[PDB]
Ligand binder design. Structure first.
Ligand SMILES: Nc1ncnc2c1ncn2[C@@H]1O[C@H](COP(=O)(O)OP(=O)(O)OP(O)(O)=S)[C@@H](O)[C@H]1O
Ligand SMILES: [Mg+2]
Lengths: 364, 132
């Protein structure tokens, strides 16, 4: 079906061959390592960007192009190694992960680091140029900063033949996280990937659905505009498109339902569907806060206000245990803040949501 | 002039209430400004107090106390038609904008300019506008 085809094309893992939306950046990268591949000299580059900008996809596409060029005997052969920071149980273990990738040897972290140092500092046999990719750089931090120092200092050696690209989310990392000598080593080589403009998102969506007439232009434009006005991320845009297809299986209304169901908060409806006693408890808390003006109140005054409200409403007299049970149930779903494990009558209570939201939920 | 005098006295007393260091503007301030206006009327030799005397009295009291685009208009016009509805008819908004003294070209320009800001989306048939 056409809807099935659209669902298949819009999947996240369905990477396109090449989209010129980042071609400029691509071209820049396509030069740098290329020069480093032609002069037989290593280098280092730091790329910082918000998630969802296609940094990993761009790097992988560049690596694919370089591999294809090498297969066509235009670039000297090279060894590619990729490591992910957050896929590692311990930081130092990365030394093993690199080593086993280049020699297959199993060794302890200290011994693996020593062997890597010996191989990258001593004039050994002429090896292929090494292209090292490290993902999630900020998660390799250490109080001693030895791993990061070695990673960004080893390509400085001529014998290393090492090219390193560090992908991260924070552009401040080389300044407030990285010390002085290593800061200048990555200095002047920072690539920043700006979020996609609504035109870029529209181009990406149109490229996803080429030769396929399933969505109207207004819905796609509104989805792209909303994404640009919210986060400017392609992943959530694809998710919204998929959910809109799902709803259409059941117009712009579909996209609106998707966006306001997958982004909006559910606190208001949870408060609305609460029980009567919970509503009385919330009203008592609000009344006590208005009387006092403080954002922290002991459980005793709240209980007194609740008793007064129950007397006003004519409800039966509530016991302390019932009120404490209701308080615990409310605190379980993170609507309030309390530590009732030991203290019972002297519990500080703080609202986890804005007061105006509570008012708008309780007016109805 | 009584209504204007009452409005001015209200403004002055509101200002004196907002400021804690201002003198207590009780009935005596109104009596004083009335006396000032009557004195000015006597000075100008007129049997009826005019608004110029009241303005001069207000000026004197204030000095004494001091010693101590078409796009926006059209956007407001179409905002007036958001009384409980998300979508607005094109013809009604166009007629209301023209009745305000704006040519349809300026209406189209304002519509496009506020459409750039992701405020709303206009139907391809130019018959209804859905406010985002
Ligand atoms: N050039 C591109 N044009 C259009 N969509 C793209 C492009 N590159 C990637 N995408 C899509 O955007 C998604 C995000 O790309 P990633 O590179 O995985 O995200 P990221 O920038 O690396 O951030 P994280 O936090 O590491 S996932 C990809 O899974 C693709 O679906
Ligand atoms: Mg990534």
């Amino acid at each position: 079906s056409v809807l099935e085809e659209a669902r298949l094309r819009l999947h996240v893992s369905a990477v396109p061959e090449s989209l010129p939306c980042r071609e400029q950046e691509f071209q820049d990268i396509y030069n740098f390592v290329e020069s480093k591949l032609l002069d037989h000299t290593g280098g280092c580059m730091y790329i910082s960007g918000v998630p969802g900008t296609g940094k990993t996809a761009t790097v992988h596409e560049v690596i694919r192009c370089l591999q294809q060029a090498a297969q066509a005997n235009d670039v000297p052969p090279f060894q590619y190694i990729e490591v992910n920071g957050m896929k590692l149980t311990e930081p130092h273990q990365v030394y093993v992960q690199i080593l086993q990738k280049l020699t297959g040897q199993k060794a302890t972290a200290n011994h693996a680091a020593e062997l890597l140092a010996k191989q990258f500092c001593t004039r050994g046999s002429p090896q292929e140029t090494t292209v090292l990719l490290v993902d999630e750089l900020d998660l390799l931090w250490t109080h001693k900063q030895d791993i990061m120092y070695n990673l960004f200092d080893w390509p400085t050696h001529k014998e290393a033949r090492l090219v390193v690209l560090a992908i991260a989310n924070t552009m401040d990392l080389p300044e407030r996280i990285m010390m002085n000598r290593v800061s200048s080593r990555l200095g002047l080589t920072r690539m920043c990937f700006q979020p996609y403009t609504y035109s870029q998102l529209q181009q990406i969506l149109r490229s996803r659905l080429k030769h396929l007439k399933a969505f109207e232009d207004d819905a796609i434009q509104l989805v792209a505009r909303k994404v640009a006005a919210l986060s400017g991320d392609a992943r959530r845009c694809l998710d919204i498109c998929r959910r809109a297809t799902e709803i259409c299986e059941f117009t712009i209304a579909h996209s609106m339902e998707a966006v306001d169901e997958m982004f909006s908060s559910s606190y208001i409806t949870a408060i609305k569907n609460s029980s009567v006693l919970e509503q009385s408890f919330l009203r008592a808390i609000l009344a006590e806060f208005r009387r006092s003006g403080l954002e922290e109140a002991t459980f005793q005054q709240i209980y007194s206000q609740h008793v007064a409200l129950c007397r006003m409403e004519g409800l039966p007299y509530p016991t302390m245990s019932e009120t404490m049970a209701v308080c615990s149930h409310l605190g379980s779903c993170r609507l309030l803040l309390v530590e009732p494990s030991r203290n019972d009558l002297l519990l500080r209570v703080r609202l986890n949501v804005s007061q105006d939201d509570v008012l708008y939920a309780l007016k109805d | 002039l009584a209504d204007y005098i009452t409005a001015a006295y209200v403004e002055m007393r509101r200002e004196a209430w907002a400021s804690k260091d201002a003198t207590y503007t009780s009935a005596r301030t109104l009596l004083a400004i009335l006396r000032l206006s009557t004195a000015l009327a006597r000075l100008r030799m007129v049997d009826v107090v005019e608004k110029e005397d009241v303005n001069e009295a207000i000026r004197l009291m204030e000095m004494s106390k001091d010693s101590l685009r078409p796009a926006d208009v059209i956007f407001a016009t179409v905002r007036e038609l958001v009384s409980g509805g998300r979508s607005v008819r094109f013809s009604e908004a166009e007629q209301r904008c023209v009745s305000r003294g704006f040519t349809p070209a300026q209406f189209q320009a304002a519509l496009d300019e506020y459409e750039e800001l992701n405020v709303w989306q206009v139907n391809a048939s130019r018959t209804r506008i859905t406010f985002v």
